[PDB]
Ligand binder design. Sequence first.
Ligand SMILES: CC(=O)N[C@@H]1[C@@H](O)[C@H](O[C@@H]2O[C@H](CO[C@]3(C(=O)O)C[C@H](O)[C@@H](NC(C)=O)[C@H]([C@H](O)[C@H](O)CO)O3)[C@H](O)[C@H](O)[C@H]2O)[C@@H](CO)O[C@H]1O
Ligand SMILES: *[C@@H]1O[C@H](CO)[C@@H](O)[C@H](O)[C@H]1NC(C)=O
Ligand SMILES: *[C@@H]1O[C@H](CO)[C@@H](O)[C@H](O)[C@H]1NC(C)=O
Ligand SMILES: *[C@@H]1O[C@H](CO)[C@@H](O)[C@H](O)[C@H]1NC(C)=O
Ligand SMILES: *[C@@H]1O[C@H](CO)[C@@H](O)[C@H](O)[C@H]1NC(C)=O
Ligand SMILES: *[C@@H]1O[C@H](CO)[C@@H](O)[C@H](O)[C@H]1NC(C)=O
Lengths: 325, 326, 330, 172, 172, 173
Amino acid sequence: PGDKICIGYHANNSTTQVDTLLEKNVTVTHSVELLENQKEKRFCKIMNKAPLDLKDCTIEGWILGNPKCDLLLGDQSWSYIVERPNAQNGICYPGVLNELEELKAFIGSGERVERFEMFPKSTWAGVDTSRGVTNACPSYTIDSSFYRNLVWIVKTDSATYPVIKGTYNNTGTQPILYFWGVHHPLDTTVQDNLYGSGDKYVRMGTESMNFAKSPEIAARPAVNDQRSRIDYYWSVLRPGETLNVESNGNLIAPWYAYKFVSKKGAVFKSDLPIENCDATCQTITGVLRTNKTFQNVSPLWIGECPKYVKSESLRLATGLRNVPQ
Amino acid sequence: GDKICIGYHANNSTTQVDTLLEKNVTVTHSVELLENQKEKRFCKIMNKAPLDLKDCTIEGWILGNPKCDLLLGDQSWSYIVERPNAQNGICYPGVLNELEELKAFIGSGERVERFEMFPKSTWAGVDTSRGVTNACPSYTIDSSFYRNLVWIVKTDSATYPVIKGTYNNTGTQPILYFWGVHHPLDTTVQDNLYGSGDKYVRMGTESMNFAKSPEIAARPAVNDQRSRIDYYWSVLRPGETLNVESNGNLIAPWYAYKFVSKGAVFKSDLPIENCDATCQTITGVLRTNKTFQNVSPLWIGECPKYVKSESLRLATGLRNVPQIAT
Amino acid sequence: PGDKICIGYHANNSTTQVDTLLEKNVTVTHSVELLENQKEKRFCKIMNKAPLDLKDCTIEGWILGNPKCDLLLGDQSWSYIVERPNAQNGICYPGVLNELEELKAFIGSGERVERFEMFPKSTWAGVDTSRGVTNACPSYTIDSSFYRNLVWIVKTDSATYPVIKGTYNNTGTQPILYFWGVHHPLDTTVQDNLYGSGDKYVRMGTESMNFAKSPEIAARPAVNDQRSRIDYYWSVLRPGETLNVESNGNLIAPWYAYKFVSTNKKGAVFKSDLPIENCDATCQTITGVLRTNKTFQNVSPLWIGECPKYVKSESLRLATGLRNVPQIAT
Amino acid sequence: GIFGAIAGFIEGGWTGMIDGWYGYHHENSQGSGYAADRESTQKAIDGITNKVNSIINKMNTQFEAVDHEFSNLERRIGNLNKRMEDGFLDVWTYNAELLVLLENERTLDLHDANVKNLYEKVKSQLRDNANDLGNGCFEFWHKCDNECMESVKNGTYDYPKYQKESKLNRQG
Amino acid sequence: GIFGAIAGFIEGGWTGMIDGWYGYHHENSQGSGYAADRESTQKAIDGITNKVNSIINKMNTQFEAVDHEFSNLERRIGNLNKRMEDGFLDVWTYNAELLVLLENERTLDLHDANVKNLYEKVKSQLRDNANDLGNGCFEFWHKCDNECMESVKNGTYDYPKYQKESKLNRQG
Amino acid sequence: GIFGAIAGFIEGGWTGMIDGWYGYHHENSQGSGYAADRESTQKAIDGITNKVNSIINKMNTQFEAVDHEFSNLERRIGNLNKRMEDGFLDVWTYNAELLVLLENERTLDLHDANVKNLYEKVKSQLRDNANDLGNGCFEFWHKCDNECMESVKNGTYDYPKYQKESKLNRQGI
Ligand SMILES: CC(=O)N[C@@H]1[C@@H](O)[C@H](O[C@@H]2O[C@H](CO[C@]3(C(=O)O)C[C@H](O)[C@@H](NC(C)=O)[C@H]([C@H](O)[C@H](O)CO)O3)[C@H](O)[C@H](O)[C@H]2O)[C@@H](CO)O[C@H]1O
Ligand SMILES: *[C@@H]1O[C@H](CO)[C@@H](O)[C@H](O)[C@H]1NC(C)=O
Ligand SMILES: *[C@@H]1O[C@H](CO)[C@@H](O)[C@H](O)[C@H]1NC(C)=O
Ligand SMILES: *[C@@H]1O[C@H](CO)[C@@H](O)[C@H](O)[C@H]1NC(C)=O
Ligand SMILES: *[C@@H]1O[C@H](CO)[C@@H](O)[C@H](O)[C@H]1NC(C)=O
Ligand SMILES: *[C@@H]1O[C@H](CO)[C@@H](O)[C@H](O)[C@H]1NC(C)=O
């Protein structure tokens, strides 16, 4: 019969639950999900900058200048790289690109390259520069061609192969990424026809680097109908450094190279489409557009992304235990 | 008058826990989460025995040191046990190049099948049967060689001709194989064994290239040898082909292994017994349901988390305050 | 007025604050700062052992015996090494010290070296020991000189550089750290001039190591007025091991070497310009001494000795007392 | 719950109290209804917000996996990188999941304490001018007007003002 | 302890109460004994079991050290591997040891709270029909039946029913 | 605070109570003063000191960064070292900072609890021999000299002894 005042707490229609150390599945009036599990399955611009689509080319095909990678050829700036898993245009003339993984890492660190002629063909005297093509390296228009960034130097019709020499002094601001090779004929016959007789060498040097190699003649298993091989090489000419080149024969010469400018870099191996959209957080499996603290999408990303955890949900109670009537 | 009182359980527990606020607190109930006890032996894992290398090292086994013939055929293992004091390894002195990656590759395996990769008849016009040494005795022959390699030498005739061999891996399994390069201690051995002139060993596959020549010099005597052999290993992928070409100093591949691919190599004293385990550490078997263990960070199978703790006891009951009885 | 008893809590003049999960800037009566942010900007002795000051020499200049580094010549003992960021005297004749990073790692982890003559000049027969000097490597006194630990061997007036051999057997209890090199002339002319004619080699072996290199002749960009190069090498001859040296030409031979004692401490190589003083420390970071009881520090992750844990935090203050609610007075 | 009020001696919550977490239900001759206690509700919101924001701030750093490539002679360093990245993944997954379980337990207890402290706040105002029933409810021994209920909710309840009226019925 | 009941204002536990954690002791003209309060005991067991299982679940990932060898030109990466493996060892040892100390503190507090809360539940039912002795004991001012004892335990105690008897006894 | 005593139903602290964390203030015809409750203060000091030493002890290992150099063909392992060392730095920074925020919250609550329990201890001895003024203060319904005050602080307060006197005075108002 008397008047009453009661002390109590909020309840509502929530059926959102959290777990605690003491109890699982506790319905609570208010809560916040800290983890993001959703993504846009596509690649977007980061910081208003498009990624580089390597398309049908591997990284090797691109920076060596595989004749079928010409659409890529020239100058590039990128927020990250997309290499397609089934890309077919790489090293067309069989051989090993030495320190490949470390090359891939250096390129990944970059944001832009400017292609330029480092050694015009006129650099090398007494030799033929117009004949260095192969049916292992076709372009889309000619059956026999070669890498755009290299010159396969061969013997002149007469006189043998002379000592050839070239230099390049880096006066620029930027480091230069460049490439060269040593040809390894299957036969002493190929060796004799392309280069002279006599012991051949390829020698290179800067203020801080030394290179020396001579050919290793043997028939390797046939790849792209080639039983010969090229050993490919890469290096980086620092600002202010000079490169000296000297060869007897078997030199695959640097021709074009790259001014290279260097945050966090990303080479994503993926088949996802690149779309005309724009993003803050790009994952190898897609865009996160979210304000959440955690994500279970991928550990591999560029931009400002939430922390990767294996959790399915991280829901924090903010309200109280929900006990409606 | 009539009493009603409120209170709590007590018992004769003398088991204690520590707390941020207090140490050595006796509680009515608690659970130890850490295992500190082990069976000092090696057991089967998944009902699969480990491979005991015995008196042989991994090198002596897989190159086929003549004194390791006990291990010679196919092998299936759940893990490998290498004895610290094993004395049969590389008998003819020299380096097994990229040893550590070899050991990591072998530990990744669960089986190998030995097969003749290059029969001795591969190499035309050379002597396939004189390639033995007092550095590599078996238990019955004073001069022998690795079972997996052939030390080719020139015929009674004057010249060692270019020899060639090809193997095409048409199989579904990768092949682990071995070769070497002999480095005589002087030019007189070089000329006796091999012809005059610059010599080479060359090998290639679709993805590999190898080239080497003899480095003639006298090194300090090891098992009475001042010469050396450079040993090499590689893996021939399914679908790959190997070409071999030499005019001298080649220690040829003979037998190789079809290789089947977490694994472990344990360097340990402990005995392997006719026993089964779900969790095997390098210092013994854990037979437990505890969450943590301070036995070892090195194991195979399903083991609890390794930590340096002596005990991790969780209070479950309450502070134990039993009535004092005199 | 009626008799009162009240229950309450301590307050004081403390203005020190802490943060909690629920609330920032809580003033509390008592607290402990767990983190140290103070350092002495200098290098001190660590096990009552002075560090090695390399001064105007680099690690290379030091253990190769760059002539301008004779201050450091001889036996040395240290708790850690300090290398100045702008030391000038390193490799003076241009070329690469092969596996350099792994040598710098080996030298840190050493606590002492004893210099000694490993191969006497007499070891090599039929060749000239004493012409092996260069404009690239001056001493302070002499314009043309060479590393104290190497002999640049040259052919004599006789046309032929003979085969030369050298042996050193380690009957000691300590590993020997030693160096050698292979000279690469700019010219076949300089090659002819200095060594024999024809194919040259440098071969070296122990019971566990082989080495073979031939000259790689080519003109390189001039450094220290040199277009030639030297490939430098290092190795460690274990107790009980024997080294054999054999060469046709182009050998920069091992002369002096180091008996090496490895250390039971960390140890460390600090690249820094801080002063070394006659002081003692328990905790030495690369940016200074910590002299503290605290649990954490934000000074540096790089240190030798017993240091508190490094964290990025500015402050780690734990409340021990209660919320401080002193009376407002007026 | 640990302070024993929520899902405890106060058996259920109030779907009718919309504007707060904690508060009051009254009944008297003029009607019945609900009112949030604005101060404790806001003080809770402030603490809970700070906790959420502290957790987000401490969780701000990221470990970055890289996907460098490794050759067929780099099995050891390749595996090292894998174990390294999986190791940090496991540590952060653990940190995040345990912290959420722990903090959810403590947040529920916080709400429980706040309700209990509100109950004791009223109890100590009313003294014996009301009967404390088991359930967080107080039945007045006098007539409590809307003004009178407001004074209770306000902390300005006047015990002497109603003491004699209460005694009459407390024994009547 | 922090709620002040266990080894606090209730000085000791009961070895004669063997069928639960928290309970009642009664003495009657019909007898006496120790009986657990099943509901609070079981709720506590479910919570504490859940805590143990959650911790076990969260701890069920392992960092795995490896047996790899390194050459005499691999001092840097060998030491990298050691520092890495020791690093995760130190982090997990820390996580487990700290967690145990913290959870034990909080587990004891939970037991203390559950005892405190039972004691408060009885005290509010009895009011002045009982006298508080110390040690969490109440002496009734009236005859208390086994049936009456059960009503106090299950929360249905009839305070009006014994008010007159109690008052007459209280100040006689 | 969680227990509602500090900065709660007891509004302020006492700068005049210099010998303990928690205490009593009294006033009677004899005089007035402050005095710490020794027993609860010393138990809190022990508990808090144990907490501090436990934290220090559990935190007494160090990750060790190293001075190693890497060459221009060691970008990947150089970066592996960097990401590893930074990774452990971030983990330990997180552990330390989160631990301090959490323990500070709990340490303040522990104090709040000890005050509340001290208040409830007195309240239940005094029963209705005293009147609750606000702010954790009790006015006695009887004369309470120094020995009576001490008995309250001691836990030995004699309610029957004063029950007649306090009942008569409680009426008259
Ligand atoms: C032996 C000599 O002096 N021959 C003349 C050349 O020196 C000279 O070319 C110049 O060489 C200069 C370097 O001279 C040294 C040196 O200090 O580096 C002189 C040393 O005695 C010599 N030592 C030995 C053991 O040979 C040393 C050594 O031969 C070289 O380092 C190997 O390359 O060279 C300096 O580099 C000048 O820049 C360079 O022009 C040529 C051309 O004038 O004439 C020779 O008669
Ligand atoms: C639950 O509550 C919200 C806000 O009161 C309301 O908008 C929504 O319609 C309700 N949900 C249901 C049960 O459909
Ligand atoms: C290259 O050019 C720069 C500046 O013109 C010059 O200082 C440097 O000497 C040159 N390098 C050499 C050695 O040719
Ligand atoms: C090194 O010294 C020991 C002791 O004289 C000797 O037995 C051993 O043969 C030596 N090594 C060589 C290669 O002579
Ligand atoms: C105190 O508050 C200021 C701003 O009020 C803030 O910068 C500082 O980080 C806080 N620190 C402490 C614990 O006082
Ligand atoms: C408190 O209550 C009175 C009536 O009791 C009311 O008029 C006043 O506005 C309220 N305001 C407060 C205390 O904030």
